[PDB]
């Protein structure tokens, strides 16, 4: 069983005061706080083992290269990929999607084809496909939403045909907390020869993820939302697909050969897609974050988080004129608006109480437009958040409603 | 005046032992060790101030955004850029050059134009231009080398004409240590309406750099070679140029607006070119590295490093059958080969003595081909290296020559 008090003791930021009051950090969906196990692992690498990593001859460089490839292996086991060589180190989810859209997209999506996304996607899983479709002369199709924040699955027969090359779909909405039925949608996409990219940036911290079970063709997520450092993410690609993908960004570490007269050759994938000096510090930190999460146990995390979410939704019933967006079974995040008050004002009062929520469009303007609002508030309920923090949120919304009503 | 013993005490890795012997780290040109001022600044941000940075409403996010923009300002002052908004945070020098080659290159280099590089360039400042020229139907021209490792400047009349759109040129060679005469080459390029990108990745740690004095149009360098964290670099672009450059990689943080029916608009530059969550941890560390270097004083650093280099070149005269490559007045690095022994074997013996040098082509295969060798050894002599470490290198080469000769 899970002990939130023991977990919280690992996170030094949670002792912080904001506005003279104890911090209630309810914005882990934008970025997660990091335990000292992760902070110190990166710091210790810099203090005692630092070097460049291009299988350099000398000992520090050789050992740093081994550490980095060990993290790649650890990450592949974390998502149950079949091979470590199916994972690419990327700057984050946004860059991973741009990499797929350029390298794979440019050579596999042609004039008259279509790509399917959903109306709940983060901008990072929309704009690369808009740009690709424009470059290539293809059509971007959109799975629409139901009022409860789930996809209108009944529209899939109208969107999938023999010209559908790709479904790009979020695992878990960063706004609504909706978990989409990936395994079944992937089966349908594969019946038409379409590949599937899964945006897993809001999934990998909430429960186990198994890309062989899912059978997805691409899977992306960001380290900094997985209690890890900034500047590092993971792109999983099926080996058979990845080994055919052409280069993207160019230079050292990714070339095999450079000639001014004979041109340039490229090295094998996954390294083909990691140009320049990698973010070795962030990779060390990410490995430590995976070890930390695996030690707690993702099923223990999920159980505690589901209990906290059930408690929050129960308690929020006592807030007058509160509008919630999304399904009853949401993961991770609660999107809401208070009466007719603008989200910006609600979040400002909450911050004044020491409570950190996010306001605005959450990088999902088409989702805001579907609900006919310009913005929402969003509270994340992560594994280090508590019932008492939920009580502070509920009381704060009650006070705000009484003060501004 | 500079005190190497005080400086070295700031760098915890320099106490390391390699192979049971005290480390002599002579590979700072591949990547620099970091002082605890830099390591701890990043760690403290994670421990006490961490949050997402997209001018979030709540206090931690607002303060993190301010910290990041303060580093941008500090970096602009470090290179004497006129405005902080002329600097883009990039993954490193390689990504910065790829950004210029795609965004600026694709809309300013047309069929029948030419681009000029030199024969001493790092692959990162070659391959993006090869790819651009192929995309666009332009010609890549090359300034050749002299035997002493300087550019054949007399060839410039044959390479520059009214169709030259860009000169892409290294400030300091990562192999030879040659410092190129940028100010004069930039004047000539500008007479033809050509822009100039300067690869400054081996310059910014050795002496002051002033991009207004240089009048370069683009300037790039990497944090991890400037005693800073991995995963972060700086791209400087003249404001008038940068404000016309179209987007590159797409998603949140760089869009102004996303609509599924009306398309997408982009935000203003510099932020236009920073898609996704930035590497906030690395940006904090980079700011601390700039403060640390500025506190030591770049002119004090240059004076000490020049003295160390003069001592090394003097002492290396006592190594039999040593071949040095490059000019007498080199900065930072000494490239060499020992007799007919392969560089890999020489570097392996040096590593066995605890001495870290780099071997191989150094991401400069055309430079290796010019000298008709497959590889070289390279020792870097940075601000924390000592006369005693130079003595260990000289003795080691003597022992290797005696043992394998
Ligand atoms: C280090 C180096 C690069 C590449 O920089 P990264 O940090 O690996 O992207 C480019 N040019 C020169 C001269 C270099 O020394
Ligand atoms: C965080 C987020 C992204 C963007 O990830 P970055 O780390 O900012 O690149 C993409 N998709 C979803 C669902 C997200 O929550």
UniProtKB/Swiss-Prot annotation, chains A, B:
**Pathway listed for it?**
Cofactor biosynthesis; iron-sulfur cluster biosynthesis
Example of a GO cellular component annotation carried by this entry? cytoplasm
Is Membrane a UniProt keyword of this protein? no
Summarize induction of expression.
Suf operon is under both the Fe-dependent Fur repressor and the oxidative stress dependent OxyR activator.
Q: Which residues carry this modification: N6-(pyridoxal phosphate)lysine?
A: 225
Q: Where found, per UniProt? A: Cytoplasm
Q: Which residues does UniProt mark as catalytic?
A: 363
Q: Which InterPro entries match?
A: Aminotrans_V_dom, Aminotrans_V_PyrdxlP_BS, Cys_dSase_SufS, PyrdxlP-dep_Trfase, PyrdxlP-dep_Trfase_major, PyrdxlP-dep_Trfase_small
Pfam entry (one) = Aminotran_5
**Which prosthetic group or cofactor does it need?**
pyridoxal 5'-phosphate
Functional summary from the UniProt entry? Cysteine desulfurases mobilize the sulfur from L-cysteine to yield L-alanine, an essential step in sulfur metabolism for biosynthesis of a variety of sulfur-containing biomolecules. Component of the suf operon, which is activated and required under specific conditions such as oxidative stress and iron limitation. Acts as a potent selenocysteine lyase in vitro, that mobilizes selenium from L-selenocysteine. Selenocysteine lyase activity is however unsure in vivo. Can also desulfinate L-cysteine sulfinate (3-sulfino-L-alanine).
User: What is the name of the protein in this document?
Assistant: Cysteine desulfurase
Q: Which organism is it from?
A: Escherichia coli (strain K12)
Taxonomy of origin reads: Bacteria, Pseudomonadati, Pseudomonadota, Gammaproteobacteria, Enterobacterales
What gene, per UniProt, encodes this protein?
Answer: sufS
């Amino acid at each position: 069983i899970f002990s939130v008090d023991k977990v919280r003791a690992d996170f030094p930021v949670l002792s912080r005061e904001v506005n003279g009051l104890p911090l209630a950090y309810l914005d882990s969906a934008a970025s997660a706080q990091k335990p000292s196990q992760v902070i110190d692992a990166e710091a210790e690498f810099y203090r005692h083992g630092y070097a460049a990593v291009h299988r350099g001859i000398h000992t520090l460089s050789a050992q740093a290269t081994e550490k980095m490839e060990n993290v790649r292996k650890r990450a592949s086991l974390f998502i149950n990929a079949r091979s470590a060589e199916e994972l690419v180190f990327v700057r984050g989810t946004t860059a991973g999607i741009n990499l797929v859209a350029n390298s794979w997209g440019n050579s596999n999506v042609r004039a008259g084809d279509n790509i399917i996304i959903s109306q709940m996607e983060h901008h990072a899983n929309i704009v690369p496909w808009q740009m690709l479709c424009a470059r290539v002369g293809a059509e971007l199709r959109v799975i629409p939403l139901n009022p409860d924040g789930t996809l209108q699955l009944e529209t899939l027969p109208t969107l999938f045909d023999e010209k559908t090359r790709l479904l790009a779909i979020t695992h878990v909405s960063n706004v609504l907390g909706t978990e989409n039925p990936l395994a079944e949608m992937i089966t349908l996409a594969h019946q038409h020869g379409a590949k599937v990219l899964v945006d897993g940036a809001q999934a990998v911290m909430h429960h186990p993820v198994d890309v062989q079970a899912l059978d997805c063709d691409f899977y992306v997520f960001s380290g900094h939302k997985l209690y890890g450092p900034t500047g590092i993410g993971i792109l999983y690609v099926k080996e058979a697909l990845l080994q055919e993908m052409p280069p993207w960004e160019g230079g050292g570490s990714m070339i095999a050969t450079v000639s001014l007269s004979e041109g340039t050759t490229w090295t094998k994938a996954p390294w083909r897609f990691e140009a320049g000096t990698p973010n070795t510090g962030g990779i060390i930190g990410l490995g430590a974050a995976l070890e930390y999460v695996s030690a707690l146990g993702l099923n223990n995390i999920a159980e505690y988080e589901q209990n906290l979410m059930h408690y929050a939704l129960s308690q929020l019933e006592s807030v007058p004129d509160l509008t919630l967006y999304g399904p009853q079974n949401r993961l991770g995040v609660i999107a809401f608006n208070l009466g007719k008050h603008h989200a910006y004002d609600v979040g400002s009062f909450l911050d004044n109480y020491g409570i950190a929520v996010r306001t605005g469009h959450h990088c999902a303007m088409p989702l805001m437009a579907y609900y006919n609002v310009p913005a929402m508030c969003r509270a994340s309920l992560a594994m280090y958040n508590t019932h008492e923090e939920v009580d502070r949120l509920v009381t704060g919304l009650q006070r705000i409603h009484r003060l501004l009503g």
